[PDB]
Design a protein around this ligand. Structure first.
Ligand SMILES: Cc1nc(Nc2n[nH]c3c2CN(C(=O)N[C@H](CN(C)C)c2ccccc2)C3(C)C)c2sccc2n1
Length: 291
């Protein structure tokens, strides 16, 4: 999708006008791969929202950015980040979304050591989001700690649907090589027709992140790690004994090369390990401003 097609397509789906007519005090607080993030106040309520600003020109695979707004608009799930509106301002796409104070899960996995109560909490939240998404034919395709955001009270939400896809009876499988190298499913790296199961394998890699602090082969070049995930046996935990038999069995249902034998999200929700999931409050102590 080209710069012109991207803008033309967006004009048909975005909300009309400029959000500056109702949002005040824009302050940049960060960035992402496709743009920046500002916080702003809803003039009428004083409520805080996050605004993602993305240049229409300086982008890659704009079609995926377009699907992210089309597919995820009107989407509502307690474990999925909320999108309120979208607008075209100048040569930029502005997406007004929910502001989550807890930050991403990556900050936590690289600065502390989560316990099985915390991990099961994140897994349960992500799995609740995936079971609903997959049932509707939506595949996230970029599951990793960076894509998990936390609320101030410790609630877990799936974010960054920039690589998502929608499969249907018409087209039941995808073949695009998308995501982040270290978290990509083997059948996906292999360019084979794949389905929702790719998210389950990625989640498995995210579990290794929560346990060891990084995904497998993180010390290897991205293309090299991909070959190893694609051709070698499932990656293993360095701290294999640091986990309970419950978590080992859980992880063994995610990291299965043959997607047909890999567990689905709906099934995993019934897995024993998740019974150890603590409450939202158990996650709070992990956050930076609380460490
Ligand atoms: C920047 C930032 N955002 C925070 N919280 C948020 N609330 N709502 C959102 C965020 C970050 N968001 C987001 O989309 N980030 C991604 C990146 N991934 C890694 C999370 C992104 C941004 C721009 C372009 C592509 C991708 C949304 C949902 C708006 C928070 S909390 C404490 C510090 C902090 N710093």
């Amino acid at each position: 999708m080209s710069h012109e097609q991207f803008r033309a397509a967006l004009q048909l789906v975005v909300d009309p006008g400029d959000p500056r007519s109702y949002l005040d005090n824009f302050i940049k607080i960060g960035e992402g791969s496709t743009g920046i993030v500002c916080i702003a106040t809803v003039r009428s309520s004083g409520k805080l929202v996050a605004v993602k600003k993305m240049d229409l020109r300086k982008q890659q695979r704009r079609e995926l950015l377009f699907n992210e707004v089309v597919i995820m608009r009107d989407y509502q799930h307690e474990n999925v980040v909320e999108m309120y509106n979208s607008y075209l301002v100048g040569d930029e796409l502005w997406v007004v979304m929910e502001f989550l104070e807890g930050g991403a899960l990556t900050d936590i996995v690289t600065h502390t050591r989560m316990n099985e109560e915390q991990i099961a909490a994140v897994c349960l939240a992500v799995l609740q989001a995936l079971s609903v998404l997959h049932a509707q034919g939506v595949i996230h395709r970029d599951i990793k700690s960076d894509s998990i955001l936390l609320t101030h009270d410790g609630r877990v939400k799936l974010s960054d649907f920039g690589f998502c896809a929608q499969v249907s009876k018409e087209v039941p499988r995808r073949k695009s090589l998308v995501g982040t190298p270290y978290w990509m499913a083997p059948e996906l790296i292999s360019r084979l027709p794949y389905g929702p199961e790719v998210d389950i394998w990625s989640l498995g890699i995210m579990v290794i992140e929560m346990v060891d602090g990084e995904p497998p082969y993180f010390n290897e070049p991205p293309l090299k790690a991909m070959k190893m995930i694609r051709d070698n046996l499932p990656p293993r935990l360095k701290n294999l004994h640091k986990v309970s038999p419950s978590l080992k069995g859980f992880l063994d249902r995610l990291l299965v090369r043959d997607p047909a034998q890999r567990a689905t999200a709906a099934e995993l929700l019934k897995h024993p390990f998740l019974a150890k999931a603590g409450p939202p409050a158990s996650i709070v102590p992990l956050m930076r401003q609380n460490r």
